[PDB]
Each structure stands twice: as C-alpha cells, then as structure tokens.
Subunit: 103 residues, 2 copies
C-alpha cells in the first residue's frame, strides 16, 4: 500500500496567457482532457483556472507510475496540442512532477 | 464551478525537510474530517525535495473559508512558519470544463 503510494506520479502544470487568448487557450487545453483520462495508467486529469487571475491555468493529473506518466509525455496527441498551445502562452507549461507523501 | 480547489506550495531548507514533512502531515486527517472537504493530500517535488505541495478540494467557498479559519490549521501553521523559506503560497482555483 506504501509501495503503491510511492509509485504514483502526479503533475502540476501551470500555463498563463494574455487576456485575448484566454478563450482559445482554454479550448485547446480541454482537448488534452478526455484522451488523457483514456490513457490506461491515468488516475485523474483536470484543468483548472485561477479565480483571481483567469489568465492562469493549472493542469493537475495523476498516474499509476513513472512509465504511465512518461508514456503520457511522449504521446503524439499531447505533443500535437502542445504545438498549437506554445505560441499562445506567455508562461510555457511549467511542470512539477511530485509524489504523494500522505496515505 | 461551485467547487474550490487549492494548490499550496511550501519550501524549506534541506536540513528541515524531514521536520517540515512531519508537521504538514498533521493537517491531513483533521482536514479530511472537515465538512465539505472533497480531498486533501501532501506531495513532495521529486527533483527538488525541499518543495512540498498540498492539493485539496472543497465543496464550496464556505467550506474552504471555514478551513482557512480552523484552529487546528492555525496551530500547525504556527509551528511550521519558522521552518519555511517560502509560503504557504496558496492558489485558489476552480475546475474548468464544459
């Protein structure tokens, strides 16, 4: 159960854009959602928006293990959406790979 | 929409890494028992272990506010504050979707 916990990999990914591209950025990032959840080792995957700074988005997702999150980062559909997103971003996806300490 | 989620970042000096981890864990079970708590978990950044994140969700604004005002939270925060070099930096966010 502790080997299960420690094997998980979670990701916080921060993205920011200019006010004018807020709707377009939101639309693109949503595309990552359902396909990511269908990836087999995906525990969860959700897009969030900062309440006081709507130009700031966070993607929070969890994976069964390193291999699942790595397979996810290498996914063609992820790269394809990332390609369209990059030019709209003022703060490029800032990724934090983390592990769960709490049971 | 009504939900409120929080990303809370904390950083410490390498030397207090274990002590900071022990204290933050104390927020865990009591937070999960708070009415309106959807989830509450502590994480550590893999490549920078001196950085922790607390990710928690609440049913609504009232629940998260009641949480921020909780005495147990303040007590643990009192012990933690001197061990921290950064934060607790809080980002209040809402789940985007369609």
């Amino acid at each position: 159960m502790q080997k299960i916990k420690s094997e998980e990999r979670h990701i916080i990914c921060e993205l920011r854009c200019e006010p004018e591209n807020r709707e377009r950025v939101k639309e693109l990032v949503l595309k990552f959602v359902e396909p990511a959840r269908l990836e087999t080792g995906c525990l969860y995957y959700d897009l969030y928006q900062k309440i006081d700074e709507p130009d700031t988005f966070y993607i929070i997702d969890g994976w069964v293990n390193q291999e699942a999150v790595t397979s996810h980062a290498e996914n063609p559909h992820v790269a394809e959406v990332m390609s369209d997103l990059q030019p709209l971003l003022t703060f490029g996806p800032s990724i934090s790979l983390i592990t769960r300490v709490s049971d």
